[PDB]
């Protein structure tokens, strides 16, 4: 796509407004709107200014001014706004030198793709991401000196089977979803068919190649919609747009969506499994008919890299305090650093695909959607490429239900990290694999560590947990 | 039809989505949705994957991946979804060997039909099933440390005659249905005429050949809709689709349906009577002018098999704890293992159909809708064939009201099983007739027994019943 | 007899002290799901001429042959004996693992997971006795106490040897070991059927008569077992509404 | 006191009941009641039996029976029960050997005192403990699949200045306590003067030698009542009786008390500072006019032991998840491991006492009362004694506000542990100083570690925090 392709699209669509978008460091898209009449060549030539102070992980107040330059390949019409709007993603640049910004997530993805080519290992990294989510009806929460609470609610939640009426006073008609029982009964047990169809249609209309949509395991409206894999930067751009469409399709239809890893205690969390393959000259590299699970040496060393760097890598792939509430046994999320074919209890699963080399890939099951896909996908690639470069051999595959291992035997396998502060500490101590080729820089890494400690870890740590009152009020 | 016929139907209808459906072991249909764009030759050639470990009766987590292959004969347009959708049922297959799955209910029905042909006895088994249901307004329930309740409700329920207002605050207008008095006065006493017309219409539009529709005996909106019999596998697919259309027609019209065997205490339960006949070379085998109730030796021995194998057979035909609350006297459901013409108190009724050989069949009144029609129909056939093959003679017919015979006479007649655990116990100890020709396998039967004990029998067993507090609080 | 009279007086006093003070008491075996039930453990000893018969320093748990054979009788007749000691439908909600009530038919010292526990009492013969942990107070103390005695007396008369004591947490045994031990009965209808088929040890000396045993069976079937069997359980709605 | 002295007390007081008491492992006192008629010489000779499997940290179900033998020194008349009652503490014993139980906390304290004598260092360790607490009006909390909350409330809590009425509907009259402003304004700002007087009186009548009573720093009714120090075991029995008297005086007067370390977020937590001193032959050992803060080598090496062993010692002195919410800066609790005279921000303060050698002691400010005082005082002693035996020199005192230290200076001092899992891990790795002389045994330490992991650390870790919803719902 060219600047001229974008102007033509805006004209043909009778666009009233253009929405200017970019990513903050933690992973939330940011925006301002310009009139169509202000969308000209100058936007591409000179760019547009914003306040870098007000964006998390960006600039200080005395060095606030920053610049944005358009990415023509990201232009998509908005499905929700009454006034016809075209959305476009931008790269962040220095306002003096016009150089790409070191803490622009989209720049990191850019640099990662270029570094890959520079290695001669491959020219394309493909990412297929499964971002699960919950379709709720309501959420409320607070934090005070003498009390704190949260509650999420959903009509299909099993906690409501005993309700006398629904929230709007209408009768309880049953057909609510049992815990761990949402994957995937037909309607009327599935109460979200029509809404997911709206989501599917909005995605098709915005340029997604769709594969499938379904209710997920969790009670209270867990869902998943799958779309075709793409190369790293494109994939991460797709992910951000996907979350926007899912959240706003829900919002326009009276619902509220969360992508948080573990909103429900005692039911499945929400992961972001990443299917990954490396290709060169249009041909796949992950396949060897003689390998365990049909994997080549290249594929096996990529896995070796992921599982070796995991203790620090999870700082980018599982970046929140809530992340580590999902990494607990019995819910199809990982609890140790094992790879295994067909195995949804493992950290890396190899899906059963047959002899087709183009279908061969690994599934990294650890990641969730609580962070930044540009950083997550890039960190995973840097880990895998360190594995290949150093020929890191992964530990032998364990083809077992990993949650049913007796404690003496469970202890003999490297475990997933317990909490966020551990992965941040470990990232601080060893991150050289990430700074290879300048893909990540020290200033980015130091900012990330500093933001997570001051804004997430410490605020949670200092606040009494409601279960501490259950355990200790009467001590 | 054929694959190409399905592609033409999808094209002619301008289908937006395709719903991929299969059956879990207990008997609930499962689904996910693909776009019309993703419905191609590839789906037929190499199939679609899913999580076998999330499906009841299927796989463990470390062997989770399973495969689905389409059945063209089952393609139907969905009458409920705003986005035009084509529903198709699939067979479950191993993802390595591509062979049919030993615990796919639809495969069991396949195997049953092919076993029949191999015996030489017949080439076609016809099943006409009468699946009764209740049209309720609401339901709620729960189970706690210190309490437990359930309540179902319906405008037409006799328990509501003294209500000052209806649920929405409108006036009580009377015309409610007396207990055991629903079969079948005209409107306004019949409050569901228009709704049952919609159900009939939706079924007609889904390729059903309809016979009749009516209010049934039970107060609170019991109902029955009858459609033309078909061969075993088609009949079981028809049953599953009929449940879907009934439940969702009701849901779209502000109501809620249950197929559970005994939702009301002191009024009729809901059965699934199965009219059964064997045919060979296009000619019926059940008729003989000289026999009792016009039955041939073949038909009599089939009945012999049903009544002889009933103590283990009811594990598939009456597969839930709630099943055995229906098998009590006074409600046109069986209490002992007897056959009789014209007799609605019997286990096997022979309906009065005259001299036409084509109309001659047996009605097995024992079964209910609480399980798996694929497994239940197959098991009934396997029992009947062991009866023919071994010439099992049924005990003398008893042409009396079976609920009202003297206690001394009732003692010579074998009674129906008292509870689920007894039929599961009996199935474990003696299931050879089911494993004939490999139709049922030991892994299926072991899985069934295991599931019922762990997820149904024990869970009910450990929970105090409300009537225990009526009997024992003051001991 | 004095003990059974004491029990009925105890229950009357507990119930009405509660009632006069704004409360309400229940002696039912399992009013709460997921928490401990209410048992009626019966510590039992036989005496002659003011001197105890249960003690022998050389026996397992300091028990005499007479005591060991009494235990033998209790564990052997239990499939029918429970018709009088655990006489209600609710009784059998208590007989589940994890709550210090028995689930299999063994004896063991110091063991609160066993059917019969021998409490640690030392060398005093006046203190040596068995604790039958199976019984609850949902029935009749006069009939429960008498039936336990008749079972123990048959054990002594026929020198019934109990199976070897299992000094382990009986809820936590591996499958192969757990299945080799006779289990407690699952439900009331099972013990009533068994009482009907085999009650000779109770009608010895005419202590229990056929008319009492027939009335008991007829009462439990008509007024308890069948009324509960025919009524849908709330949890059937949790499991089956959407079938 | 002898057996006969207690029998005489029970007689003279015309006692109706005797309450048999002992300590569980975590720190809660247990009890059952016997009639005065059953309190006889057999109780002293034979003891009394209980179920060791229902007490936490004690026996398994198959080895349940345990024995109790009385301690005549601990006999006091109960101030609350209408039926005149004498309370007596017991020691736990093996029912076969009659030996003391290895996991009886009261036995541990007894072993500690005997070990002290055997060293020659001293013959008496005196403990003066300051157990702060909150006098609340109410508390509620829960933990569900879809939500979790807690709330404490008190009339004097600053969060209530804006209330239209009080809980009972009467007018808001002001004079509520500002956060951090409760130490210690006159009434009516102090709303608990009369209640604290009732507490003081009850304590006086139970044989406590009282020093003072006051409102503490926290809003919402924080309080402290100080009594005369005593030798290790006596001091620990005193602490347990003190907690019982405080809680039940509040209860009988319409209130509810908590000793939990940090019930309020952003106000002072509740500590249990322990003033400590060693004496030999009736003479003090802590004093030397020439030492810093008038401390002797014995005293300095005792402090050196406490600060060196703290990383594992806090497993007994700060034994809960909630403990580590208190160990944050700005609330007069320690954040690092230094000693300093006059310094309420330090880990060990030396109170200003002057020239009197009997008044000379250390204050260990780290501990709270969320656990077991028998274990905590014993663990403190063993750390101190290891310090004296090995002449461990503490790092130079830092006589500054330790919360306000410059980044370089702060980082040069060892911080207190962040969380319970860290101190439990460290106790497991290094606990030889505790097992000296068999005072603590391996079985005790192993059981403690096991209890805390399975019943406290893990249960909190798996439950989502409400603030995670504040941070992450919209990711
Ligand atoms: N060779 C490949 N490399 C990377 N991703 C792939 C490849 N083949 C397929 N994918 C992607 O993997 C994802 C699989 O998602 P899904 O079907 O939900 O898998 P799962 O079996 O884990 O549920 C899809 O996004 C798909 O486009
Ligand atoms: N020869 C036959 N073999 C099997 N099923 C048959 C045969 N003839 C009719 N049926 C089916 O039996 C069912 C009868 O249902 P229904 O009219 O409700 O009977 P009932 O008299 O038991 O109420 C229908 O589904 C019908 O198509
Ligand atoms: N020599 C000593 N050794 C141990 N404890 C002592 C000694 N002298 C006094 N104490 C005790 O120390 C405690 C001091 O408590 P408090 O007056 O609240 O002190 P502060 O608030 O200044 O820390 C009292 O219990 C007191 O009896
Ligand atoms: C059914 S599941 O295994 C569930 C994944 C889980 N929600 C997780 O937290 O990773 N997902 P998929 O089959 O789509 O890979
Ligand atoms: C009127 S009935 O006998 C009622 C049967 C009852 N509902 C049962 O089988 O539980 N049905 P049908 O006449 O359709 O055979
Ligand atoms: C503490 S317990 O073991 C509990 C017994 C349980 N309530 C039961 O159902 O038997 N009772 P006891 O120690 O009084 O014999
Ligand atoms: C006023 S304070 O310093 C407050 C101590 C604080 N509550 C703590 O958590 O240690 N106590 P004290 O003066 O009684 O030693
Ligand atoms: Cl953390
Ligand atoms: Cl059952
Ligand atoms: Cl029963
Ligand atoms: Cl912790
Ligand atoms: Mg998926
Ligand atoms: Mg998924
Ligand atoms: Mg996946
Ligand atoms: Mg019919
Ligand atoms: Mg009918
Ligand atoms: Mg019929
Ligand atoms: Mg007892
Ligand atoms: Mg003080
Ligand atoms: Mg204080
Ligand atoms: Mg102090």
């Amino acid at each position: 796509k060219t600047p001229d392709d974008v102007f033509k699209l805006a004209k043909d669509e009778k666009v009233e407004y253009v929405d200017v978008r970019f990513c903050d460091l933690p992973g939330i898209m940011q925006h301002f709107t310009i009139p169509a009449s202000a969308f000209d060549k100058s936007v591409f030539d000179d760019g547009l200014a914003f306040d870098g102070s007000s964006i998390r992980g960006f600039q200080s107040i005395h060095e606030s001014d920053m610049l944005l330059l358009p990415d023509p390949e990201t232009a998509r019409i908005d499905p929700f706004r009454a006034a016809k709007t075209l959305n476009i993603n931008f790269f962040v640049h220095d306002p003096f030198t016009l150089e790409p910004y070191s803490r622009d997530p989209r720049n990191i993805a850019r640099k990662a793709e270029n570094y890959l080519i520079s290695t001669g290992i491959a020219d394309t990294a493909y990412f297929g991401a499964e971002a699960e989510f919950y379709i709720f009806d309501s959420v409320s929460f607070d934090s005070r000196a003498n009390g704190s609470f949260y509650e999420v609610d959903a009509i299909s939640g099993w906690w409501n089977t005993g309700a006398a009426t629904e929230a709007d006073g209408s009768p309880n008609r049953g057909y609510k979803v049992r815990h761990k029982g949402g994957y995937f009964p037909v309607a009327p047990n599935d109460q979200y068919v029509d809404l997911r169809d709206k989501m599917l249609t909005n995605l098709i209309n915005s340029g997604f190649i769709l594969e499938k949509g379904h209710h997920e395991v969790g009670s209270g409206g867990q869902a998943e919609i799958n779309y075709q894999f793409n190369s790293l930067l494109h994939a991460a751009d797709d992910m951000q747009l996907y979350k926007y469409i899912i959240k706003n399709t829900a919002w326009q239809n009276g619902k509220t969506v969360t992508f948080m890893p573990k909103p429900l205690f005692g039911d499945n969390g929400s992961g972001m499994h990443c299917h990954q393959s490396l290709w060169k000259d249009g041909a796949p590299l992950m396949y060897d008919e003689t390998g365990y699970a049909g994997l080549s040496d290249t594929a096996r060393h990529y896995i070796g890299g992921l599982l070796h760097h995991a203790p620090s890598l999870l700082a980018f792939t599982n970046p929140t305090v809530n992340s580590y509430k999902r990494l607990v046994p019995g819910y199809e999320a990982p609890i140790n650093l094992v790879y295994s074919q067909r195995n949804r209890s493992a950290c890396v699963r190899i899906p059963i695909t047959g002899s087709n080399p183009k279908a061969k890939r690994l599934e990294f099951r650890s990641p969730d959607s609580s962070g930044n896909p540009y950083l997550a996908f890039s960190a995973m690639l840097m880990a895998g490429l360190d594995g290949i470069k150093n020929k890191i051999e992964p530990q032998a595959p364990v083809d077992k239900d990993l949650y049913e291992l007796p404690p003496e035997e469970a202890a003999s396998i490297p475990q997933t990290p317990t909490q966020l502060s551990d992965v941040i500490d470990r990232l601080e101590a060893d991150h050289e694999y990430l700074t290879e080729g300048g893909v990540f820089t020290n200033d980015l890494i130091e900012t990330w560590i500093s933001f997570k400690r001051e804004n997430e870890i410490e605020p949670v740590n200092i606040r009494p947990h409601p279960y501490e009152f259950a355990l200790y009020y009467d001590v």
Side-chain angles (χ1 to χ4, degrees), chain A:
Chain A
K1 286 193 188 77
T2 161
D4 274 325
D5 290 348
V6 189
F7 291 132
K8 185 175 149 45
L9 177 68
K11 203 191 97 69
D12 297 347
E13 288 281 346
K14 290 210 74 204
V15 156
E16 300 163 61
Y17 300 105
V18 173
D19 200 70
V20 177
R21 304 190 166 195
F22 62 98
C23 197
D24 73 7
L25 199 63
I28 309 294
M29 295 305 278
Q30 308 294 312
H31 85 115
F32 62 87
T33 298
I34 68 171
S37 72
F39 185 51
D40 53 30
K41 285 199 186 191
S42 183
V43 170
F44 289 84
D45 293 333
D46 311 317
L48 296 160
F50 73 100
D51 176 20
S53 284
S54 293
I55 312 297
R56 297 170 299 167
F58 276 28
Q59 297 290 99
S60 61
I61 196 165
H62 65 291
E63 297 171 344
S64 63
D65 297 38
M66 290 299 289
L67 193 80
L68 299 159
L69 296 170
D71 189 343
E73 287 168 52
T74 64
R76 306 288 194 273
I77 292 288
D78 191 279
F80 311 107
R81 287 161 81 157
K84 193 72 162 288
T85 305
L86 185 64
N87 303 330
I88 306 164
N89 288 355
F90 283 61
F91 293 99
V92 187
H93 292 257
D94 182 283
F96 292 109
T97 60
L98 316 167
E99 281 276 287
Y101 190 38
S102 64
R103 295 195 292 279
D104 176 10
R106 302 196 67 253
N107 190 40
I108 310 308
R110 252 214 299 235
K111 290 189 283 168
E113 289 188 328
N114 285 338
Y115 174 76
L116 170 63
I117 295 159
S118 93
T119 65
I121 296 170
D123 54 51
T124 320
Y126 290 114
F127 281 82
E130 306 159 67
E132 304 166 314
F133 59 93
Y134 273 99
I135 314 178
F136 291 143
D137 296 347
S138 63
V139 59
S140 49
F141 55 84
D142 77 4
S143 173
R144 294 159 279 122
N146 65 307
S148 184
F149 89 100
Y150 78 91
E151 192 190 72
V152 296
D153 206 3
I155 183 169
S156 68
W158 193 251
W159 54 88
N160 286 332
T161 62
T165 65
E166 299 303 337
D168 67 352
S170 66
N172 191 333
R173 289 191 292 166
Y175 283 92
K176 303 192 186 299
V177 175
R178 294 167 187 90
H179 288 297
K180 312 250 291 266
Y183 183 119
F184 30 43
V186 292
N189 202 27
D190 189 343
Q191 310 199 16
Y192 305 91
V193 180
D194 276 347
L195 179 59
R196 291 199 311 265
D197 278 355
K198 286 163 169 184
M199 287 172 181
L200 290 165
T201 297
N202 284 343
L203 289 163
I204 286 162
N205 292 341
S206 305
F208 289 80
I209 297 82
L210 279 305
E211 292 184 4
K212 61 162 158 53
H214 57 87
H215 202 295
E216 259 285 346
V217 178
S219 188
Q222 203 181 31
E224 180 180 322
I225 293 166
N226 306 114
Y227 51 93
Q228 189 168 275
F229 65 99
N230 212 331
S231 51
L232 196 157
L233 175 62
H234 292 334
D237 276 323
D238 284 351
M239 179 55 73
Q240 294 298 67
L241 179 53
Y242 168 89
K243 289 175 95 178
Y244 171 79
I245 287 166
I246 294 305
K247 289 181 188 185
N248 289 286
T249 307
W251 194 272
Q252 275 198 345
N253 291 289
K255 302 293 178 189
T256 174
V257 161
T258 182
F259 278 88
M260 75 185 289
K262 198 80 178 185
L264 302 177
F265 174 59
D267 210 330
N268 273 33
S270 288
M272 189 188 64
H273 311 154
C274 293
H275 294 246
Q276 287 156 79
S277 62
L278 299 176
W279 295 54
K280 180 147 204 173
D281 301 310
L285 307 170
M286 314 293 279
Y287 185 78
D288 187 335
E289 177 255 36
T290 63
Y292 169 88
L295 298 165
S296 58
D297 288 354
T298 299
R300 201 182 56 259
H301 295 141
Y302 192 103
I303 293 165
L306 288 171
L307 300 186
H308 173 72
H309 290 292
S312 69
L313 169 58
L314 296 212
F316 287 111
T317 71
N318 296 71
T320 63
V321 173
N322 189 244
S323 286
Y324 299 84
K325 268 78 184 193
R326 173 178 159 266
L327 301 180
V328 301
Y331 305 102
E332 306 185 288
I335 50 145
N336 56 27
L337 304 179
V338 167
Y339 98 104
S340 175
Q341 72 175 346
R342 209 177 178 192
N343 192 353
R344 283 171 159 84
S345 74
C347 196
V348 172
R349 160 179 158 255
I350 315 298
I352 313 307
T353 49
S355 71
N356 188 7
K358 301 189 180 186
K360 202 84 232 170
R361 81 279 196 170
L362 64 94
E363 176 204 41
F364 192 33
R365 288 183 68 90
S366 185
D368 66 47
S369 2
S370 67
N372 187 319
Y374 306 97
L375 305 178
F377 297 173
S378 296
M380 296 174 222
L381 185 59
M382 295 311 286
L385 297 175
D386 189 62
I388 294 164
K389 191 156 289 197
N390 289 302
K391 290 178 267 150
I392 298 169
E393 291 287 338
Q395 61 181 215
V398 181
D399 300 352
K400 294 173 169 176
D401 177 345
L402 297 167
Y403 316 132
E404 294 305 313
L405 292 168
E408 340 80 54
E409 287 164 34
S412 64
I413 323 266
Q415 310 277 294
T416 50
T418 287
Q419 59 198 49
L420 182 68
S421 65
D422 290 339
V423 302
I424 294 295
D425 288 351
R426 179 64 176 140
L427 177 71
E428 193 177 46
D430 172 50
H431 50 259
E432 296 305 302
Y433 74 104
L434 295 169
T435 58
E436 297 285 347
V439 171
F440 287 75
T441 52
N442 285 344
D443 69 290
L444 190 159
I445 290 169
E446 286 166 27
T447 300
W448 190 254
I449 290 161
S450 190
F451 178 93
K452 293 289 168 182
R453 287 174 177 164
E454 299 170 358
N455 294 105
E456 296 182 29
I457 296 164
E458 195 179 30
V460 167
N461 280 356
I462 59 172
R463 283 169 169 84
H465 195 291
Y467 205 64
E468 289 168 29
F469 291 80
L471 290 167
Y472 311 124
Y473 184 87
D474 63 349
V475 291

